[PDB]
Write a protein that binds this ligand. Sequence first.
Ligand SMILES: *[C@@H]1O[C@H](CO)[C@@H](O)[C@H](O)[C@H]1NC(C)=O
Ligand SMILES: *[C@@H]1O[C@H](CO)[C@@H](O)[C@H](O)[C@H]1NC(C)=O
Lengths: 51, 438, 438
Amino acid sequence: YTVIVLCGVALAILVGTASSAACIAKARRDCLTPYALAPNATVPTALAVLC
Amino acid sequence: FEHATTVPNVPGIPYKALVERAGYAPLNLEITVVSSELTPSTNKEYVTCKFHTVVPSPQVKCCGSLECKASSKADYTCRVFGGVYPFMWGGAQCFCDSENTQLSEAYVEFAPDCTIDHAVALKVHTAALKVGLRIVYGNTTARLDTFVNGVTPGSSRDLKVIAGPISAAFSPFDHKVVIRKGLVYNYDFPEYGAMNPGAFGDIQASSLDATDIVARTDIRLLKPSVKNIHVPYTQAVSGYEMWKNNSGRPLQETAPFGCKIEVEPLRATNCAYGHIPISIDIPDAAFVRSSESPTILEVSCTVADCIYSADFGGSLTLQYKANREGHCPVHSHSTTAVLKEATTHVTATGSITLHFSTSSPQANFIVSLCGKKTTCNAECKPPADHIIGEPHKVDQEFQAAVSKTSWNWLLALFGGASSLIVVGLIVLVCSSMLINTR
Amino acid sequence: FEHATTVPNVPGIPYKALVERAGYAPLNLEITVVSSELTPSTNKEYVTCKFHTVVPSPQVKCCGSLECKASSKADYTCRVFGGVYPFMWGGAQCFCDSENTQLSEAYVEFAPDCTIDHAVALKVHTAALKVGLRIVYGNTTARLDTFVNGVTPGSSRDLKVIAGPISAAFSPFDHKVVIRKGLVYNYDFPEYGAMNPGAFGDIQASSLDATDIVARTDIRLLKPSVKNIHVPYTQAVSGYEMWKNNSGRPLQETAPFGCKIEVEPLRATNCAYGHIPISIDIPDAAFVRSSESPTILEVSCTVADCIYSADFGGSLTLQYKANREGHCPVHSHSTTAVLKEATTHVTATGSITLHFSTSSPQANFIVSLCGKKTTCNAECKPPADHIIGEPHKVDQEFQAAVSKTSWNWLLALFGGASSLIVVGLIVLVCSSMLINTR
Ligand SMILES: *[C@@H]1O[C@H](CO)[C@@H](O)[C@H](O)[C@H]1NC(C)=O
Ligand SMILES: *[C@@H]1O[C@H](CO)[C@@H](O)[C@H](O)[C@H]1NC(C)=O
């Protein structure tokens, strides 16, 4: 029984980390999706959040 | 008042319960299963044992002709022989060159010692179980012995108690059984009227002293080939002896749950499987009004030390404040932990120590002192000694072995990553709205 | 040689079969089930009968005090009463103004005539079936009686014959039965130890003459209320009498398949249901080489008239040409029809009739005369009478009631529209090609 709980915990944490990484990467891409070269940076706070 | 319970069907494990009714102080109720008795219904099929081949004096019809004749004795085998020439210590018993003939017959019967060495085959069905209960209430003891079936009552010592059918049925006996010299064996004995030489049940009889016997054991005669008179017989080895040699272990060393099997009723006793639903009716007279019962105030727990031991080894202390001298009950309504004593004296401000047992390390529960309740918790450690044969697991484990620390670790590890992906989608739609604004 | 068959378990319906061996003329084999015998295993639960209330003289104490005392008698009831003042024809039996006290007790015992009116409750199980078979082969008759189980060959002439097992188990008896004065009733009697007033089995005893009895019948005493001395008792009406009044019809008039139920063994007899597979072993010496068997030539059927009757009413004739005088067997391998005699004398050019029965209006089949076969057919008509109580349906109907004319009408019934649609498709493709050429 004890082996199952650890494996399930590892699976859950891995799935959560992967989902969070994918979500944050997609959010960064959407924020960076516009080329933004014609004007300056929309807001430096958004740039800081991005990186 | 009628009050029901489910009690484990295991000897020497008292069960404590209460009875709640407005206006009357709680009354302790102790139930003990003194000993079980599973007696099945059986019918005698037949009896077999070592046999003995009779060899009656051969008939001689000499210088003549003779013919074989059948009979009614079991396994009767007959045969004539011509050209024989009997001789005896006196000399030639007749006078003719091979014209004589001799008739030889053989049959079988159970040996005298069988009168005590018999092995009888039985067919069993519809196992029934009887339970002896001892009940204690209001420091008064009552007896009863009832069949676990619910239609039958048991009235004893002012009380009539009705049992309920076992939850899960146990029946160590198989459809076929053999009993011999006080030993029970699980074996598929041949059906009556089916004889196979060199195997159990080669000789069969309805009763030990039944004049009628049916049996075939492959007896074949041989033509005399010696000077003197002698009937040579040949037969297979006795089946009963062969079964005795390799009968295997008896049922005492194989019955599950350690059922002590006695012979003269052919019944098992003192062995545990399943639970008994049992309803107790209690006279209203035995109950006591709460008005005269002691009144308690400001009850408090304290766990000096508790050991997660198989044997009852946990300790506890209670401090109360009351006004009336008397006796009050005590109980632990949490099934995980079981107390030791039910009733205790009560003083104005006295404290009393209690003993208990638990099956989980996180020993937390609510204890009822007299008419009032009190929650309390503590942690117990495993014991040094890990093998002991005294009453253990008064309550079966309920996945409560998980301590609060383990739960805390498991909960803390998990994080809201689903919320994180939801926030990712939210910021995606927000970025879409931002593009709209742009 | 060993030869197997399936026979309908039903008395008075002979079954004819053959055994085929190269170089041996066919041997008839007739099997008859003389009488069925179904005996189940039973145990004695208890016995009951009309009871009788014992009203022993009341214990009177003059100018004193007295108390009740319990006893071991079944249904024992006690009660004391103060203020008694018994009187008799002589006068007062005590002299003090209400100090005296009278104790009255009561118990119940089975009535004497019970010895013959007793009703016994039984539990039955594991029905076992016994068959009596009579087998005729080569104008030699033999008998046997065997358990239906196919593992206990019967003994007859030191011959082993195996029967069964039954295709579908049948037992008119229920789990719980009761028996009284030669009549069996199907009833759900209360289990031993459970007494209900005004119902069957209120008085229960292990044996008729058992000193130990357990029973309750709601006996309540009444305070004395008349000048003289008496112990007024009130009790519910006897349960056994009430059960007798409305017991319902016995099992003799409800058992399916017309089973005759005898009491002493408590077993059913002479009643038919299901099929029996049976294997018969015949000694080789019984067989006769075909060399000595009569030789037949140019066999021919002729159905003078056939009646589609329940009984054996169909007629047939056979014309044969042979060379050797003797007896030849005759049979009908078609299950739909069964002949009357198995063998007949054979002459050089004789012709002989035969009586047969059939279960269809179209009576066509192959009849084997001695070693040779002969097909032949005829049409039978229904009989004038339509209700008789003689062995009927020696062969069960096999949806063969359809007549040849009915089959011809069915054949003329169907119509081939599939050909029409196929022609339509063919002309469709051809006309599509033509339209392309248009
Ligand atoms: C049982 O407990 C009650 C409660 O106080 C007490 O009055 C009674 O005397 C006790 N009975 C015995 C036999 O000690
Ligand atoms: C039985 O039939 C055979 C064959 O014809 C015959 O030889 C024999 O005599 C018959 N036995 C009896 C007893 O009729």
